[PDB]
């Protein structure tokens, strides 16, 4: 079973048909208005014409911008890309800010492209190479066995040498990727098992399919791996290719040109038939922690015509811009990008509604509760907060369960409230006890 | 006969395949042939400045060199 | 200087041991170099070139088995052993079965009506590390009898695979005492066949046979309630005379589970 | 004599929290003492954690210094056992220079968080009989018996290669993985021939194996998902984990890891092991990380995060502004807050008759009284440090126990922070830039 | 249609300048509405652009926020067209890790000056339907051109290189005379007959050798990465490119110079573009002095809003957040705020663009928004309107589908107006 | 000395190959023996800098320094101090000049005062510029 | 054994150096192969620092690249 987490009971926005949102479906309550516009979002990603749409979900703490965010994700499945991110983590000692930002913009562009991958397949029954000075090896015979027959082949001195890479004899069983040169020897046939009592081999049966086989299948991948790709490459044959990958591994500051190149040939696969992009959305969570040069280099970043949709969160007032040291502005967020965002309004709950909550959560993590207990509950979360009272349904099963009881009543619920002390509280000691 | 073909193993119906990465190719980046000849000079007003290679650190030294060079 | 510090994976073992056991990840893509193409290379250049790669190549002639293994990227996954027989509970039950037999020093036939049954059965075999012999129908009946002497001279193989399908004349004697049977099929002459040679297998031993269904299915339907008796008559019969000879009947009995 | 890597720290002493079976703390038990509530709360945490349901629960250890907030993790620590991972760290640690501060609190999160990976192995267990091996292409043969049965094996040629490079000789007892033949050895049951010079090792002797040569047995291994990134995130990238040139592992990888554990997990392979990460001195972090902290958390792979401080209402670093704790209150509201209180005199007298016992030392019961009215007037921690001094002066007069005259006696040779306070205030024309 | 890696963006509406030929600017042209004063110093700074002649020339374009000053910048670009360099960067994006920011700049600087050089090659092309080439090699060439057949003599110390990769049956190929390369197009089906994303020509014509010019502009970024290492042209894409040293620029400096006179090579100058110039510093704008002084320089654009604003890495103030310094050595493009018409004409554009209806009605509603709120704002509420008529199943967007949208989203001074009356609720004001 | 190469195939050779992938080259003029007194000009950019890293080599660690990055490296005043030794016995015997040029530092202002107090020591120099 | 290479007579040519005649003549030697002299070496304290900090760290020594 999977374990439990703040956000597993959200499975969606509980929009009806007509887009309207019901009171309580998809383990969201409340906040009808938000909801009603993130479907409006929905329905904007799900078009695919658009291109560096912004959005920000602006509210207290506590009252679900990033479950909206989640239940968007849901609301979308698995197929769009959606990728996560906190603004924290563009502050990189590898690589600058502006680059770790335009490759999760990339990230969040999907792309499904029909590969044709040749493959072979079989037990070598015999290897012998070709050479002579144009001295040096121009070609390897090889000969493979199938059940449904056999072939012979002549192959590039690369494969060759990737053949003397896995220690390949005769009557070993291989598997060779002509698209990238691999090779894997799966082991030595099942024909030769009994001629030893015991010996180190680990043995395979023989294959059953033809020896060369022509195969199509869809591979799932982002613009930036397209880009980080090229721009350390890792498919050569080459020496200096295998010189170059002795270097410990960082990230690069990836060029616009390798990105337009990029661009250019996904459009000809498009143009071609062979791919079907798939834009996708970027969720940066506490932008308030990006600084001024983050926010100003969004405002190009944003009027892209590649760029994903986005969506913001931030619960600041009118803080202080991070590196301005003296500009106050609303949501920690400079004026100027916030004239490029949809805002998204949230709401504090009402106490029906953080019972309703408190409720959803507990049927979520397996737990059982009296009415009286939910009662305490809620005046406990109408008192501190939302997620102080989500808090303790699992300490007071645990006590209800040392107990021999099978469910939580009042008196669990009042120890642990006596145990495990809130902010409030906790400052309050401070500030009075001292 | 399907229900009967998935009963005794599932990879009769649905066998699984190994996954691979998308084999992309090279970019292909051209170029003019004078970009490579930059840098080249002539030889009536370039290189040969080996005299002042001091770490060539070539064969012997100068305890026996000091002879040679009197 | 040095120590047992590489024991990194806990209950001693190389930690090469451990690298196998966890090392899966892919690159999503993996590209060649880009290639610097210009239309008439100048002479310096590629002289250089030429002469860097040739002694970069020599230099690491002594290295280069073990640079390019180093260097080299993982770019297949492959479906792991042990989901063969993870998958089908059938070949979980097998697995006991025959090693209690292998314990007791027993050798078995395994029988199945499709072939690609049996081509499973190699890697699981072959996963339990038990020798085998097979026959089916592209076997000729000279490599078939030839098959079939071989498995009764040697006693080094441990088992034989047979499809049902592809008996034939020919086999006098069968130096075994135990048979299993992967599933049963709706032809009522197959399984006419099937019991004559649970008989003419030979009283010179005693015989034991197991016959595999999955519970819960049409295969505990089918077998113990015998409504095989009920379809026989469509093998011979064929579809042409008659649509919905099964009742309606016969469908809800055959099709449900608790 | 014979000392150990280990010595007696400041925390030895504690062996556990000294709990009931139904959570109540005893007053003293398994080396603590008094801070009954929070050693309760503690036991319920400890409780949270094996059960392993819930993901990313925070709880915050608060009070003044020397009440015991490390004391109790540390009791956690023992209580919980080491099959269950357990990842300390302080504050400062995170600011590296290979790496960024969301980067080392991902390898923090990730190093406690375990995998339970099993699966199936054969090998082959015996007293060596005989061995043969006929070398010029190689052939051998081998002989291999147990208490029950003995057998006569025909070699292949890798075999015996594995053999001759393992110089595996008659007598010898050994295991052969069957799956690629690695030979391990385990001993010898019969001694070497005593007419041969100069290789007369004695050693000593193991038993023959039991039952069959043949055997199949699962096998458990332990590996943590941060051990699971660095392995893959590059060639030859397992040096990381003792070198520590683990520098910004890219997020892909760690996507395809959680994807492929939790297959692992549904296809029967692995167990996960969510452990607990414990950051002492949490005031240390800064806003970057307490922002970064807040998502993380909401991750099902998130272990249970434990934190320690002492500050009041305190500035938060990286800001200019002030909150409890030093602490942003977006955190607050995700956590439990664990409250400890300053000892009695009767719980201070007995933590250092419990220190004494871990030292070895015997004072009588006038020191006792003494050294705890030091402890009240001064701090706890002075006092236990006075326990050795006192013992080491009573020892170099020859003495047997501790008296009052040598507690006075180190009470005049070392001084508190106060009394050099005081001093310091009195030369405070000869100290520097007051 | 099919989803194309380009999608329709904030400035995907403006194609050019609307201007004619005397560069008086048209009311509505090319996608562009207003700013008449700054569109024609515009055009008239696109003219010096393409003529060339002087080097070093700087302008800012400044105003309020929403003024189109970006969208002037962008129809600069789409009227200057590819054939000349147009390097456009955030002055965010110089702050890298890898190089300091004068050689960010330095470089930036470079990939807006483009060299042009032109080669001469020869070709032969034909079909192979069969080789009879053995491999020392014998073969000749058993080719087929439409023309007249590719059989030709060939020389015995190479016709390996003929066979080297994999040169079968069924495929079209071309040959060097002088470099001797060999290419291949694949399975085309005139000779393939008996694959997908092949070449799908049929048999080739031409009199076998054939003369081609090639054309290629190469930026001095170019020259100087690819001849600063062994296999630096990799730096171009991997952006492994550390400190180019002084001593590779000045040489290529004086290379590029001599193929100018020489008549090898001809210098097309670019421009630069550094939107939100703000974010540099005072070792930025001091760098920029000197480098726009040199002859190899491209002209310069810039943006930034602003008014007396701090210059980042002082406590000083001067108009634009740049020092006097600079813009003593630039041209300042004022734009103005937009009228109703003006505002109105956009947002009908827009719509034109995102293919939308609305009604009139809707349209005033709309501009009444834009005047009130923002023209961003009431840009983005075309999308959500049209959503929201689309979901009702509505053919054109009325005025209640964008009162609820205006209900949903809401812009900045009704939000801050929110967040003030929970002072409270909201952090660290 | 020891350098060798080909300039290319004789162009009276035109009908010897159908095909090529070196160009010809026509014959030289004027004696055989070609002689001419040559001048070049230097700074640190191949004394200082080429001591520094050694460009060239045949050992293996020569060849794969030629594509590591090139990262410019703090020079050591003892490498400098041999340069100016050696470059003073060539002017000695005569085959090189001297010739001292002039720094331009423009906007001075932006330098640090630790630029300021090194250009003091670095000014006092008697190896310095103008 | 560590065999080293100093010069060449060209024996053909005598009383020649510095023209066009026997101009790849080094030394001859002048005394009994049995050469022992002492030798000393001035070298700094960071100099056997940096040697011994590296396979080949003299080159940092020229760099600076410690």
């Known amino acids: 079973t999977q374990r439990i987490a703040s956000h597993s009971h959200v499975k969606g926005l509980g929009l009806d048909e007509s887009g309207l949102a019901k009171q309580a479906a998809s383990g969201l309550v409340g906040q009808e208005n938000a909801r009603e516009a993130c479907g409006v979002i929905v329905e904007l990603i799900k078009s695919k014409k658009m291109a560096g749409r912004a959005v920000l979900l602006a509210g207290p703490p506590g009252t679900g911008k990033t479950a909206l965010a989640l239940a968007i994700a849901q609301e979308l ?79 590039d001195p690369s494969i060759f040498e990737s053949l003397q890479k896995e220690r390949v004899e005769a009557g070993d069983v291989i598997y060779i990727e002509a698209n990238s040169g691999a090779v894997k020897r799966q082991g030595r046939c099942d024909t030769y098992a009994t001629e030893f009592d015991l010996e180190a081999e680990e043995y395979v049966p023989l294959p059953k399919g033809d020896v060369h086989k022509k195969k199509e299948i869809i591979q799932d991948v982002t613009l930036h791996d397209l880009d980080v790709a090229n721009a350390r490459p890792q498919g050569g044959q080459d020496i200096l290719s295998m010189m170059g990958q002795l270097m410990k591994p960082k990230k690069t500051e990836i060029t616009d040109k390798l990105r337009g190149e990029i661009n250019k040939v996904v459009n000809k696969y498009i143009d071609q038939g062979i791919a079907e992009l798939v834009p996708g959305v970027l969720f940066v969570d506490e932008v308030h922690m990006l600084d001024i040069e983050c926010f100003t280099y969004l405002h190009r970043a944003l009027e892209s015509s590649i760029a994903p949709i986005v969506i913001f969160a931030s619960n600041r007032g009118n803080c202080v811009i991070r590196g301005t040291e003296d500009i106050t502005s609303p949501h920690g967020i400079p004026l100027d990008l916030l004239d490029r965002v949809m805002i998204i309004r949230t709401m504090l709950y009402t106490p029906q509604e953080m019972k309703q909550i408190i409720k959803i959560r507990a049927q979520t993590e397996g737990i059982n509760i009296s009415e009286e207990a939910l009662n305490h509950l809620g005046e406990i979360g109408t008192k501190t907060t939302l997620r102080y009272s989500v808090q303790l349904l699992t300490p007071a099963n645990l006590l209800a369960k040392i107990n021999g009881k099978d469910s939580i009543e009042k008196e669990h619920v009042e120890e642990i409230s006596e145990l495990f002390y809130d902010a409030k509280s906790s400052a309050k000691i401070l500030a009075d006890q001292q | 006969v399907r229900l009967q073909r998935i009963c005794n193993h599932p990879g009769l119906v649905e066998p699984r395949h190994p996954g691979s990465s998308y084999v992309a190719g090279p970019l292909e980046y051209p170029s003019a042939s004078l970009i490579l000849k930059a840098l080249e000079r002539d030889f009536w007003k370039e290189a040969d400045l080996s005299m002042f290679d001091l770490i060539g650190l070539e064969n012997k030294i100068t305890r026996h060199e000091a002879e040679l060079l009197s | 200087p040095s120590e047992l510090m590489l024991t990194l994976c806990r209950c001693g073992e190389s930690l090469q041991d451990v690298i196998d056991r966890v090392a899966f990840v892919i690159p999503p893509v993996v590209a060649a170099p880009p290639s610097l193409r210009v239309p008439r290379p100048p002479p310096l250049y590629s002289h250089r070139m030429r002469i860097l790669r040739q002694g970069l190549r020599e230099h690491a002639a002594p290295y280069f088995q073990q640079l390019r293994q ?80 071989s498995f009764n001279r040697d006693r080094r193989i441990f088992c034989a695979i047979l499809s049902t399908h592809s008996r034939t004349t020919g086999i006098n004697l069968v ?77 809800q009995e055959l099709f449900e589970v608790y | 004599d014979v000392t150990r890597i280990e010595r007696i720290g400041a925390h030895s002493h504690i062996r556990g929290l000294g709990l009931d079976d139904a959570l109540e703390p005893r007053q003293a038990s398994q080396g603590m003492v008094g801070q009954l509530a929070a050693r309760r709360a503690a036991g319920v945490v400890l409780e949270m954690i094996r059960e392993g349901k819930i993901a990313g629960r925070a709880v915050l250890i608060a009070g003044q210094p020397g009440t015991g907030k490390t004391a109790i993790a540390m009791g956690m620590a023992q209580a919980l056992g080491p099959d269950t991972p357990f990842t300390a760290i302080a504050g400062s640690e995170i600011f590296s220079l290979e790496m960024s501060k969301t980067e080392a609190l991902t390898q923090a999160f990730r190093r406690s968080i375990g995998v339970r990976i099993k699966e199936e192995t054969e090998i082959i267990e015996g007293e060596v009989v005989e061995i043969q091996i006929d070398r010029p292409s190689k052939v051998g043969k081998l002989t291999l018996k147990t208490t029950e049965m003995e057998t006569i094996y025909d070699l292949g040629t890798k075999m015996i290669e594995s053999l001759t490079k393992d110089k595996v000789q008659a007598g010898d007892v050994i295991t052969i993985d069957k799956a690629t033949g690695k030979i391990s050895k385990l001993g010898r049951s019969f001694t070497r021939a005593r007419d041969y010079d100069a290789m007369g090792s004695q050693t000593k002797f193991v038993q023959c194996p039991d039952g069959e040569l043949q055997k199949r047995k699962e096998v458990v291994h332990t590996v943590s998902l941060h051990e699971i990134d660095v392995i893959n995130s590059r060639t030859q990238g397992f040096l990381a984990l003792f070198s520590g040139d683990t520098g910004e592992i890219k997020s892909e990888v760690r996507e395809q890891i959680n994807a492929k554990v939790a297959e692992w997990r549904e296809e029967g392979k692995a167990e996960i092991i969510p452990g607990v990460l414990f950051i002492d001195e949490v005031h240390m972090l800064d806003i970057e990380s307490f922002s970064f902290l807040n998502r993380a958390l909401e991750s099902d792979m998130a272990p249970v995060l434990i934190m320690a401080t002492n500050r009041g209402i305190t500035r938060i670093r990286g800001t200019s502004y002030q909150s409890p704790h030093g602490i942003p209150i977006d955190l607050l509201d995700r956590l439990l807050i664990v409250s400890t209180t300053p000892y009695s005199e009767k719980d201070t007298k007995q933590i250092l008759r419990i220190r004494c016992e871990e030292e070895d030392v015997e004072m009588s019961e006038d020191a006792y009284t003494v050294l705890t009215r030091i402890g009240l007037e001064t701090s706890l921690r002075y006092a236990i440090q006075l326990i050795t001094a006192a013992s080491l002066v009573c020892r170099k007069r020859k003495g047997t126990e501790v008296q009052v005259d040598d507690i006075k006696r180190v009470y005049s040779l070392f001084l508190d922070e106060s009394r050099s306070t005081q001093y310091m205030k009195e030369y405070q024309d000869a100290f520097l830039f007051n």
């Not at chain 1, 698995?78 to 999760?104: A, D, Q």
């Not at chain 3, 197959?190 to 008989?199: F, G, I, L, S, Y």
């Not at chain 3, 009283?203 to 113990?224: A, Q």
């Open chain 1, 77 to 155: 499945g698995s197929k769009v890309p959606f990728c996560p991110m906190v603004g924290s983590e563009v502050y990189s000692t590898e690589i600058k800010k502006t680059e770790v930002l335009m490759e999760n913009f990339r990230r969040a562009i999907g792309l499904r492209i029909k590969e044709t991958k040749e493959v072979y397949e079989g037990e070598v029954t015999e290897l012998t190479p070709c050479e002579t000075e144009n001295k040096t090896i121009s070609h390897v015979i090889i000969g493979l066995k199938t059940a449904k027959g056999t072939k012979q082949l002549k192959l």
């Open chain 3, 70 to 149: 180093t260097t080299a990227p993982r770019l297949l996954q492959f479906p792991e052993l042990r989901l063969v027989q993870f998958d089908s509970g059938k070949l979980e039950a097998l697995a006991i079965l025959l090693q209690k037999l292998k314990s007791e020093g027993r050798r078995v036939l395994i029988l199945s009506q499709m072939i690609l049954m049996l081509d499973i059965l190699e890697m699981f075999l072959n996963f339990h590390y038990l020798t085998y012999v097979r026959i089916d129908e592209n076997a000729s009946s000279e490599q078939r009898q030839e098959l079939m002497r």
């Open chain 3, 175 to 251: 130096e075994a005492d135990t048979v299993v049977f992967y599933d049963n099929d709706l032809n009522p002459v197959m399984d006419a066949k099937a019991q004559e040679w649970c008989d003419r297998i030979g009283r010179c031993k005693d015989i034991h046979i197991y016959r595999l269904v999955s519970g819960n299915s049409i295969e505990e339907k089918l077998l113990k309630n015998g409504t095989k008796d009920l379809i026989r008559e469509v093998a011979a019969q064929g579809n042409d005379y008659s649509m919905a000879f099964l009742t309606q009947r016969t469908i």
